[PDB]
């Protein structure tokens, strides 16, 4: 139709205008600004603890706010709450559906979430006074599988779906507060800002969107990737975020600049990133890979400053303690090591 | 205060026993993924006192690209086939050549065996229209034609079988094999065929662990 063609041309014109504005914004580049900083050197980290007890492949992992307890999700239908310091399992939650692709630890330490191909986000009450751990709520409004779920507060949760939609739930009533539509492919990862007002969402359309939780509406769309975005992670100050993809690149975007700054890629890496995380100071950018390794990039100068090795299969989850003392990597070999 | 430290060890040793108990249940059961050309369906059946666990992801989207990686430890993938044939062939290409499914075997199930008998007889939609090579395909004579069907149907079925086997035994270089089969709308012995194929799959996997085959 004439209206559709005219509207598509109008959209193309605004895309060109946005591209021109971003190009005029990029007076300099981060590579040529950070040449007068001493390199971090060589970072050697060793497996302090190896945590065994999973039968199937570990598909998700989340640290606690106290940097002591971390939860793990496995395809055999288990949620194990470990104690990193003593290598002692504290809980073993059996899941209704064995296919779980996500797990979230509440900041208060009272609830843990899980979800997968069952299309359902289930919250587990760990405190469970006068009883054992049981399902507290069964959030079911998603047509597609859950890829990532994160806790804003102890009462409300944000989840991603394979039906091209992010959701903000109210656990007390078990209902959708806002729906985050606007993507075109499967949403695969979320990252909440240090202030729980904004969150980014990677997807399979090679685009990362900036969402406002209260307003329920996009603010920026970041497109600099060639393939699906698998991992996403905010900078500690909340003014930037790294983005891993399946094209062997993990770029860094800015919110104020509204464009990419630095691409972290090497010619010897032909695999895909499955996990992206930042150090406490933001200088080190840890990244997972399908080559059974984990590289320690330097966020300011895009050079490799360390390799973490020791996984038989691909790393599928990576996390850094809020204390910033240790980094945990989980792989498909049913193992979960802690590096420090 | 060592009381907390000993209580933690006691809880650890209590849930480790439960994990050991659940390990046997996890290992003694065999998972299968059933797909063709509330949100997930689970079917449990046992034949000859061995437990199976069949799955049917029919409440999701058509982008079977991110959640197909979850089914890599599954012992076998049941591929049911009813231009839907070309779509099935490309789907089998993608499943076979996926770098995470290189060690997962596929058990084909070519249905509509009785439906094609009338379709070829009518001639309204000739198979040669979609597959020009069918005009020069001859049965390899190592077949088992059921008395009652013309050679046209027993050639057509083996044509699709040969297409799937051409996909299968050509690339991949992985620890996996394909098991073609023919079914109908009245038989109930397909569970036995799945049981035998799974027996073969774990047999070959064990033999390759011993590095005999």
């Amino acid at each position, epitope marked *: 139709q004439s209206e559709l063609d005219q509207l598509r041309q109008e959209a193309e014109q605004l895309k060109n205008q946005i591209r021109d504005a971003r190009k005029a914004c990029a007076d300099a580049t981060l590579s040529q600004i950070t040449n007068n900083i001493d390199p971090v050197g060589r970072i050697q980290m060793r497996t302090r603890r190896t945590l065994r007890g999973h039968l199937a492949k570990i598909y998700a992992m989340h640290w606690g706010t106290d940097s002591r307890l971390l939860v793990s999700a496995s395809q055999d239908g288990k949620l194990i709450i470990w104690d990193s310091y003593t290598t002692n399992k504290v809980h073993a939650i059996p899941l209704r559906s064995s296919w779980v692709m996500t797990c979230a630890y509440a900041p208060s330490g009272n609830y843990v979430a899980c979800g997968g191909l069952d299309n359902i986000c289930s919250i587990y009450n760990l405190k469970t006074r006068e009883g054992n751990v049981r399902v507290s709520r069964e959030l079911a409004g998603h047509t597609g599988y859950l890829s990532c779920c994160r806790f804003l507060d102890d009462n409300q949760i944000v989840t991603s779906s394979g039906d*091209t939609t992010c959701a903000l739930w109210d656990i007390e009533t078990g209902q959708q507060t806002t729906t985050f539509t606007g993507h075109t492919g499967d949403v695969m990862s979320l990252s909440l800002a240090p202030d729980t007002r904004l969150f980014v969402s990677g997807a*399979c359309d090679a685009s990362a969107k900036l969402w406002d939780v209260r307003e329920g509406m996009c603010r920026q769309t970041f497109t600099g990737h*060639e*393939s699906d975005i698998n991992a996403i992670c905010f900078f500690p100050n909340g003014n930037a975020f790294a983005t891993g993809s399946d094209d062997a690149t993990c770029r860094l975007f800015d919110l104020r600049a509204d464009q990419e700054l630095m691409t972290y890629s090497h010619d010897n890496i032909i695999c895909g990133i499955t996990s992206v995380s930042f150090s406490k100071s933001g200088r080190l950018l840890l990244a997972g890979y399908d080559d059974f390794n984990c590289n320690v990039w330097d966020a300011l100068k895009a050079d490799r400053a360390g390799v973490l090795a020791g996984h038989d299969n691909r790393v599928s989850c990576l996390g850094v303690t809020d204390d910033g003392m240790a980094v945990a990597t989980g792989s498909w070999d049913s193992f979960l090591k802690i590096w420090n | 205060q060592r009381n907390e430290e000993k209580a933690q060890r006691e809880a650890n040793k209590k849930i480790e026993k439960q994990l050991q108990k659940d390990k046997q249940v996890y290992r003694a059961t065999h998972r299968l993924l059933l797909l063709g050309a509330s949100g997930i369906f689970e079917t449990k059946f046992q034949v000859d006192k061995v437990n199976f666990h069949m799955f049917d992801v029919g409440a999701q989207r*058509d982008e079977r*690209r991110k959640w197909i990686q979850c089914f890599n430890d599954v012992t076998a993938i049941i591929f049911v086939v009813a231009n839907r044939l*070309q779509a099935a062939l490309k789907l089998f290409d*993608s499943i076979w050549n996926n770098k995470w499914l290189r060690d997962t075997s596929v058990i084909l199930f070519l249905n509509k065996q009785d439906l094609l008998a009338e379709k070829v007889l009518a001639g309204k939609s000739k198979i040669e229209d979609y597959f020009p090579e069918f005009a020069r395909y001859t049965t390899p004579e190592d077949a088992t034609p059921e008395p009652g069907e013309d050679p046209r149907v027993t050639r057509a079925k083996y044509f699709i079988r040969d297409e799937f086997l051409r996909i299968s035994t050509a690339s991949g270089d992985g620890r996996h094999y394909c098991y073609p089969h023919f079914t109908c709308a009245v038989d109930t012995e397909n569970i036995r065929r799945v049981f035998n194929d799974c027996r073969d799959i774990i047999q070959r996997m064990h033999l390759r662990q011993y590095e005999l085959l």
Partner: nanobody
Framework: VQLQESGGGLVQPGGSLRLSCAASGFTFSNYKMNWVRQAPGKGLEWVSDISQSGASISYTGSVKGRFTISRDNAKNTLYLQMNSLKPEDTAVYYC?????????????????????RGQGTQVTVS
């Protein structure tokens, strides 16, 4: 990732037509490409494909011997040449790209949901 297609139009039966796709955003030499089509009142059908270096090419039988595919890595463009068209070969032709680099598998015929696909061009035979 942008894939702009052109070269379509109304063609008399038994004629010829050459569709071209302009690719911008990705390293064209690392991704296996595809050509898909959608006949009116039907679903998306796979027509052809090509490998990273153009070594491996496959067709969908009904187009075998009449259609040929070719890719130019330097110019980041991909062509599909159509010879002896028939009225049955009328559809909107899309130029889908396989999801990931250095991969032999391609899940790129999704029901109007694939992100890495072009807007498509109309090719009519009458």
């Amino acid at each position: 990732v942008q894939l702009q297609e052109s070269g379509g139009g109304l063609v008399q039966p038994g004629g010829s037509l050459r569709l071209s796709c302009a690719a911008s955003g990705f390293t064209f030499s690392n991704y296996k490409m595809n050509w898909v089509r959608q006949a009116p009142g039907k679903g998306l059908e796979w027509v052809s494909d090509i490998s990273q270096s153009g070594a491996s090419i496959s067709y969908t039988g009904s187009v075998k011997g009449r259609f040929t595919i070719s890719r130019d890595n330097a110019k980041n463009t991909l062509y599909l040449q159509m010879n002896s068209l028939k009225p049955e070969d009328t559809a909107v032709y899309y130029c889908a790209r396989c999801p990931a680099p250095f991969t032999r598998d391609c899940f790129d015929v999704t029901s109007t949901t694939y992100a890495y696909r072009g807007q498509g061009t109309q090719v009519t035979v009458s």
